[PDB]
Amino acid sequence: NIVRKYAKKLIDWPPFEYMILATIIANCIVLALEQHLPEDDKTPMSRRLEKTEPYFIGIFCFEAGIKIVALGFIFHKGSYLRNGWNVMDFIVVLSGILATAGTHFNTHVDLRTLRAVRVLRPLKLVSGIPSLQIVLKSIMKAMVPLLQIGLLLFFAILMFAIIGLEFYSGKLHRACFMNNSGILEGFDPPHPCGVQGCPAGYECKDWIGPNDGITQFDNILFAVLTVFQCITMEGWTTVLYNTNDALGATWNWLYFIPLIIIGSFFVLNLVLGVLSGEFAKERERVENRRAFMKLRRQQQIERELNGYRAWIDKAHKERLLRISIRHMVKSQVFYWIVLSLVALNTACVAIVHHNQPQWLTHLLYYAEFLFLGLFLLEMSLKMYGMGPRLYFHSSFNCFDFGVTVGSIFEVVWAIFRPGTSFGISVLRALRLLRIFKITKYWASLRNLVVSLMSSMKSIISLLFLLFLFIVVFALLGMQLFGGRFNFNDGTPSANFDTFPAAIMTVFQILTGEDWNEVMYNGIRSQGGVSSGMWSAIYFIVLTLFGNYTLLNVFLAIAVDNLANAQELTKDEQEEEEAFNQKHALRHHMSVWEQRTSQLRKHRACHYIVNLRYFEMCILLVIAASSIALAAEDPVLTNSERNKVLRYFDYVFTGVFTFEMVIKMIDQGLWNILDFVVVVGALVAFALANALGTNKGRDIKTIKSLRVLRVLRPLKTIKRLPKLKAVFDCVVTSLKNVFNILIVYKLFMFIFAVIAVQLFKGKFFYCTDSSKDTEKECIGNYVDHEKNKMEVKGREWKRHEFHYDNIIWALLTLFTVSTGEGWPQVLQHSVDVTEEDRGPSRSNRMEMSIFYVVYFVVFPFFFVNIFVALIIITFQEQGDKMMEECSLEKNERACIDFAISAKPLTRYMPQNRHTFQYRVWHFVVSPSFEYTIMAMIALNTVVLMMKYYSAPCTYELALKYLNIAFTMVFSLECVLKVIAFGFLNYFRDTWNIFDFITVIGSITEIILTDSKLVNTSGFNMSFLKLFRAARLIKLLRQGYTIRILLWTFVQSFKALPYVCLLIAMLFFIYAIIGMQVFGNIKLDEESHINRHNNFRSFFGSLMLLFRSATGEAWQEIMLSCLGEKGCEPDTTAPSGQNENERCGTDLAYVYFVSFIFFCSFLMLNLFVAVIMDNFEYLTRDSSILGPHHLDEFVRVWAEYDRAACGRIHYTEMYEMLTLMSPPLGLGKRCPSKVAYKRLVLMNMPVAEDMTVHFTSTLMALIRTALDIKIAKGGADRQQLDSELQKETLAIWPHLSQKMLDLLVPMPKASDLTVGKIYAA
């Protein structure tokens, strides 16, 4: 079976690989055409197609046959299966052979599980095109570092699930149903019970869980799914509200806020940091520097070539008029005429709206033709007037020709199909980007476009892989859930029946927004909270490996193509401003640039205002005034508190004016903020004290000039010199991303204009689904669908987020960008028919293309462009210390913790008595520590084995297992105190943690039993935490999770003001919200509920956090708008029927801005952390950081136990000849290579020919990193003098005892431990 003379290996060749490539495309089309019907039903077309599967199976088994006979199978090394892709090729064809062997046995096996392998057939495209595999491998290569955030993530999910199991395990099963015996009612958002009982006339009956039983903490598997849902931030507030109802709203915020902060924000920070480190380390590989230099050289060629092409300045009608054309048609007044007339074109097509006055329709009708013809003329004048042959040589010239032909297309197609007019003539607004040519920002952007246009075969071949995996997951979802979504309510819009509706729900699940509800449908599809929950695993493996592989793809693209355009533009100013300006006669280098370059290298009276207690005693008043803002009651206008705080308002404005006046005295004429606040306070006080009446509706005047008070916290920014510095960092980041913010705004405007042309006037609907016009939608109608059959009135409405004016298009596209509620906008956009006609379900299903090209551009591409610009260009915060430690920088400087790490164990009993070497022995030499890690790994299981409604003995089984594990752990505790000593035990920061946990568990076991009455107004539940903290003991045996956590928490401790700006943002907006929307009448039908309201400071803080985490903020914005009801206020006799205006239309500004500020101020806090640890995140095995450097302590303590000496020299080559080679020799290099390393290390001697600890430490450090070392002689000592000067320059706190130790001064006369075996 090794028969040579194959003759089939020559058939694996040019043509029979381009036929397999076509059979696969045909097969993918066939799998696309299929439609899945609910119960054994089949469309005629699907029966038609089911008669092609044998053809494809035949061709694929033929491929297996020819490849197998022309190669080996397994035993041959280069055989068939030894390829990685051929094994899955073979599995797919195997299942093709098997699944078509059903009729023979009538499928008595009842597989229902083998044609689901067919969905892997699209991946055979990757197998057939290696140009796609070598992109896929690169992508999968960038995600290997992530498999420690995942373990960090799954730990957090587990740690918060255990806790959930303790606290909400069975407490979500009673709901408040209307008494109404027989027909129980309940709410539409069901209201749970607890000791918090039913409100008015409802009774507390049984209930399956919240989402038909799916969103509860019953098992551990139900808790690690609810908590995974909350971490993805989808519907985490519904869970928070359920547990608030079911238990009481006082402690639940402690579980769900740190679950979102730790699990959802901190994990984004880790993932961004890890990926950015990986991108810095991957841009410098040789095969990537090579392909970048190939781009920089070609940019040099073109840059000089255009300058040379400027030297072509040559000075009957073939030359008589065609000389003046090309003159004028390139003059600087012509560019400006064209660019000031395209700016009229894009203002003409941006004023179209719905119901535009009938004169505008005709005026703009003439305008399209006028401008189109004018651009035809001033395009031909470039083509017939300068030459078609050399016409396509400018990029935007090709682009303008394309837009002109497209506009001609649009005119014709509007003529022959009136209606849809998607109007590609706003694309000419792209020419406005040419305006940048007149600024200094042209290079930064032309280089970006050059770096994008070069790397386009690798962006397309990468979007194509995203598309293949979406197709595979769409077909898999069709298999699992195809036609099973026909519920008795009606099939949802997020189907899996047909292909265009499976693609657009896999797209939701990737963009991860409302994957919640799709998963609930896909669970009740296959059963319920029952046999059906095994399919919560398609929506987890697609909302994880999608929310993360799509930020590693779109961040790789945007960091690569933007670090390229930053290094391309650093080599213009480094030539045109540093080469010619010299030969024709650091320096603000960001953190990323530094790191990647390092990798590639491998009146008189008042002036006594100043009292040391004036600029610090006004700060206290600012703080007290800010806090007093928080305690206003928004609703009870004339309560006790509001009067007390009004007197405080007098006090505070008095202080602020008495200091503003003296400041203006000493300063004459950030302070404008002080001025505005004091002027507003004075004006409000004056015109409220004076009359208050006799001016039209001027209660709101004082109410609105008291919103200016919220600026009082802002006054601190100038006072605190470091808060001011962080604020300025935020502003300079905003200025960095401002040439791209404008390109973003321009592209978003173009999409908004297109969306207005496409959906204007079409977002209307009658409240009665049968009528579909404003003429018909009048009267009353019986509503059966509420299942109450009640007579309502027909109203003709718009949808709330429509696209009938460019302002409304911009707002409802911003809503799509933030992600919230875009599935509903897509649902409205497909169900669209004609102007002023009502919807028709899943009509015009192609308007979903607009909503994927949108996502590929704005939420995926530009947002990652912004993250990458802020990462790449981030300046070190404080660097004004002699050019940033000119000679010893991050890795050099920080590796000098040799001033530390002197100590060693010092824990051995050193008594050799009994217990001294008995217990402290037993403890060491694992036969005890392994057995105790086993008890940790089993106590982690008895915490996962809680569940609700257990049999009985299982419950006691758990109690006694807990007792046994607590007994073993308390034996841990008092078996190391007496083995390590009382003082030594409480000093390792993990022993005290274990002690706290064992004490907590012991007291829990005591308290839950008798001999202490469980009264005196105190609750014992929190002690369960001490039992669930034992799972943290699994983290101790980490050291790769622990290093990340320590590294990223340290850099949170070094930015105490970056997360004070976010607290101040939240404070300012919470106070504004309380003032403005504080007295909206709560309505459970709206989103100003009893849960979600601005009624209190902490309620508004929760509302703002809910919105920041992107949780239906759009509907809070809509339910805060004008004309809403109002609270009774129970303190006034007037304004009962009136002041039915207690909303406001500033909600749009209030929520569109916060979402832009909180999403920006968080980005900074992310980058400010990432760039803090950029040395850890770009650490490498080649390049030393402290990561390798602590191994030296281990090898020292074990192999030497020197204690400042006690080495002589044997320990040296007893050290270096074994341990890993970032420090030098290593095991495989005990040769003359080691000899020539040692001859570079030279350092003095001691009593027994010995040396010091840290002297050797610097010896290894400098001999590896090359930190100021010569080849010998007094040369190395003068270099050492330089090094000593540098060390004193960094650290003055080193005494000459320790300093001389670090600069051991090996004079030439004094022989070394290095020049002993050398000579």
Ligand SMILES: CC(C)CCC[C@@H](C)[C@H]1CC[C@H]2[C@@H]3CC=C4C[C@@H](OC(=O)CCC(=O)O)CC[C@]4(C)[C@H]3CC[C@]12C
């Ligand atoms: C220079 C370019 C890029 C921007 C120019 C701005 C316009 C595109 C914006 C500015 C304000 C907008 C207007 C703001 C308010 C309205 C009223 C509103 O129409 C109605 O009141 C409906 C009933 C009616 O037409 O009488 C929506 C269209 C319109 C004119 C908007 C159309 C688009 C306008 C003119």
Ligand SMILES: CC(C)CCC[C@@H](C)[C@H]1CC[C@H]2[C@@H]3CC=C4C[C@@H](OC(=O)CCC(=O)O)CC[C@]4(C)[C@H]3CC[C@]12C
């Ligand atoms: C949380 C505190 C310690 C932060 C620092 C600010 C405090 C020094 C002061 C500044 C203004 C003070 C407030 C000014 C006025 C009032 C009204 C005063 O009267 C009532 O509300 C009594 C109502 C009742 O009897 O129930 C109660 C304290 C309170 C809220 C004060 C609480 C303490 C505040 C916030």
Ligand SMILES: CC(C)CCC[C@@H](C)[C@H]1CC[C@H]2[C@@H]3CC=C4C[C@@H](OC(=O)CCC(=O)O)CC[C@]4(C)[C@H]3CC[C@]12C
């Ligand atoms: C400004 C930069 C980002 C250029 C990229 C934008 C355009 C290339 C995109 C924006 C939205 C897209 C459009 C949005 C949705 C549709 C509707 C879809 O259905 C139709 O309108 C045609 C059939 C019909 O409805 O009669 C056809 C593709 C089209 C025009 C899309 C084609 C590509 C468009 C114009």
Ligand SMILES: CC(C)CCC[C@@H](C)[C@H]1CC[C@H]2[C@@H]3CC=C4C[C@@H](OC(=O)CCC(=O)O)CC[C@]4(C)[C@H]3CC[C@]12C
């Ligand atoms: C019985 C199990 C299935 C219940 C749940 C606990 C597990 C997650 C246990 C099973 C065995 C345990 C492991 C047994 C031995 C080791 C080796 C050791 O791993 C190290 O990182 C060692 C130090 C190093 O080499 O850096 C200590 C942790 C670990 C992985 C243990 C971690 C916890 C594990 C994986």
Ligand SMILES: CC(C)CCC[C@@H](C)[C@H]1CC[C@H]2[C@@H]3CC=C4C[C@@H](OC(=O)CCC(=O)O)CC[C@]4(C)[C@H]3CC[C@]12C
């Ligand atoms: C890595 C390994 C060790 C996973 C850990 C296994 C156990 C710690 C977990 C995983 C599966 C869990 C089980 C999944 C489902 C069920 C069925 C369910 O029991 C019922 O019949 C409940 C009925 C009801 O609640 O009305 C809840 C307990 C139990 C056995 C769970 C108990 C805890 C189990 C065994």
Ligand SMILES: CC(C)CCC[C@@H](C)[C@H]1CC[C@H]2[C@@H]3CC=C4C[C@@H](OC(=O)CCC(=O)O)CC[C@]4(C)[C@H]3CC[C@]12C
């Ligand atoms: C070593 C630690 C970390 C885990 C040990 C797990 C198993 C060895 C044991 C411990 C408790 C046992 C459970 C204790 C009680 C019950 C209830 C029992 O059902 C009854 O109602 C009991 C009827 C009877 O026997 O009288 C069925 C077995 C079961 C689930 C046992 C199954 C086996 C379990 C899980």
Ligand SMILES: CC(C)CCC[C@@H](C)[C@H]1CC[C@H]2[C@@H]3CC=C4C[C@@H](OC(=O)CCC(=O)O)CC[C@]4(C)[C@H]3CC[C@]12C
């Ligand atoms: C019971 C199942 C369902 C989950 C149990 C909890 C896991 C999330 C925990 C238990 C043990 C933990 C592991 C214990 C030890 C290690 C080895 C450790 O690896 C290293 O640090 C590499 C060695 C080195 O470089 O020092 C860190 C990850 C890991 C797998 C830990 C990851 C998190 C684990 C798997």
Ligand SMILES: CC(C)CCC[C@@H](C)[C@H]1CC[C@H]2[C@@H]3CC=C4C[C@@H](OC(=O)CCC(=O)O)CC[C@]4(C)[C@H]3CC[C@]12C
């Ligand atoms: C559920 C998760 C998110 C919380 C777990 C707590 C961690 C944030 C903290 C708690 C205790 C910390 C540990 C406490 C002490 C040390 C020793 C310390 O060691 C070093 O400085 C480096 C090694 C050396 O040079 O000796 C810093 C890492 C480590 C393991 C810390 C790592 C980060 C830990 C695990």
Ligand SMILES: CC(C)CCC[C@@H](C)[C@H]1CC[C@H]2[C@@H]3CC=C4C[C@@H](OC(=O)CCC(=O)O)CC[C@]4(C)[C@H]3CC[C@]12C
């Ligand atoms: C990244 C972090 C460390 C920066 C600083 C914190 C901020 C992100 C802010 C914004 C959201 C704030 C939280 C928003 C919501 C709440 C609930 C709020 O709840 C209550 O006081 C009562 C219960 C209820 O909310 O109904 C208490 C403040 C708190 C935790 C806030 C604490 C401070 C937070 C986390």
Ligand SMILES: CC1(C)O[C@@H]2[C@@H](CO[C@@]3(COS(N)(=O)=O)OC(C)(C)O[C@@H]23)O1
């Ligand atoms: C680490 C980093 C930034 O991401 C990798 C890898 C090599 O370059 C990538 C970047 O994507 S692209 N098409 O803009 O070149 O291109 C591919 C080949 C897709 O892989 C990309 O660089």
Ligand SMILES: CCCCCCCCCCCCCCCC
């Ligand atoms: C040796 C190079 C190839 C590495 C092994 C094959 C990888 C590709 C096959 C598996 C792809 C994922 C299949 C599961 C569904 C997404």
Ligand SMILES: CCCCCCCCCCCCCCCC
């Ligand atoms: C030679 C062209 C000069 C262009 C100057 C402005 C460029 C602005 C950045 C363009 C980014 C395009 C991204 C489009 C969406 C994928």
Ligand SMILES: CCCCCCCCCCCCCCCC
């Ligand atoms: C990623 C690109 C594909 C996007 C798929 C969704 C749009 C599908 C457009 C064609 C819709 C045809 C509907 C036929 C009847 C269901």
Ligand SMILES: [Ca+2]
């Ligand atoms: Ca959401």
